[PDB]
């Protein structure tokens, strides 16, 4: 069965069709890279609301809420992207938060050499998570582990306690629901440092483009880059 803790995490998940329709409208309302900056900016709004909605997170005071989000926003962006490929993804395509399916080689061209490399690394993680049978229960657990980081507080006791209970619930779930997949718990946690390295490289690239004058007006994205 599913631990009750994970059932509460699943309740915080955004309504996927409504998020798609909303970001779709925003983009329909400029380089392709510039359009993706807009798409990421809108995704960050959805991420902030997700955490704001969230059990546990909504108990922290604003100052603590800001630190956690400033520390993991890009990691959550990449993790969300990766899981989106795991579920809705196909070979040689990229699925966007707007619901669009684009050919990888086309969007990789538009992304340039550097970004294509990071996108390709992420696709490697997609393939590994698929072979591990990564599912939605495990996904929401990783999202909260990324959000409630210990490497970041007025209430470190809450953060530490959330981290320990989510870890225990994820171990219980993977052991009980994928017992033939040996060490699935550890194999999932291994990907968090990998995703974080990708997100650090992504931030440095976007920060470079911003200083270079290539990132159009996106106040939330830019503010998080300056955090």
């Amino acid at each position: 069965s599913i631990p009750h803790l994970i059932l509460e995490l699943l309740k915080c998940e955004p309504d996927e069709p409504q998020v798609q329709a909303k970001i779709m409208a925003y983009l329909q309302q400029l380089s392709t890279f510039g359009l993706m900056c807009k798409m990421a900016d809108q995704t960050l709004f959805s991420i902030v609301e997700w955490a704001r909605s969230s059990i546990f997170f909504r108990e922290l005071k604003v100052d603590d809420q800001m630190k956690l989000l400033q520390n993991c926003w890009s990691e959550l962006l990449i993790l969300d992207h990766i899981y989106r490929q795991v579920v809705h993804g196909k070979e040689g395509s990229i699925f966007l938060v707007t619901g669009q399916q684009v050919d990888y080689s086309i969007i990789a061209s538009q992304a340039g050499a550097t970004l294509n490399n990071l996108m390709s690394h992420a696709q490697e993680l997609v393939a590994k998570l698929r072979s591990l049978q990564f599912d939605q229960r495990e996904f929401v657990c990783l999202k909260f582990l990324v959000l409630f980081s210990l490497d970041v507080l007025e209430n470190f006791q809450l953060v530490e306690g959330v981290q320990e209970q989510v870890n225990a619930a994820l171990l219980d779930y993977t052991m009980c629901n994928y017992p033939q997949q040996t060490e699935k718990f550890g194999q999932l946690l291994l990907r968090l440092p990998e995703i974080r390295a990708i997100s650090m490289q992504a931030e440095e690239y976007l920060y470079y483009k911003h200083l270079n004058g290539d990132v159009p007006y996106n106040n939330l994205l830019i503010e998080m880059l300056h955090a």
Partner: peptide, 9 residues
């Protein structure tokens, strides 16, 4: 801060 504005709403 826009982020702080979002969290205070």
């Amino acid at each position: 801060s826009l982020l702080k504005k979002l969290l205070l709403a």
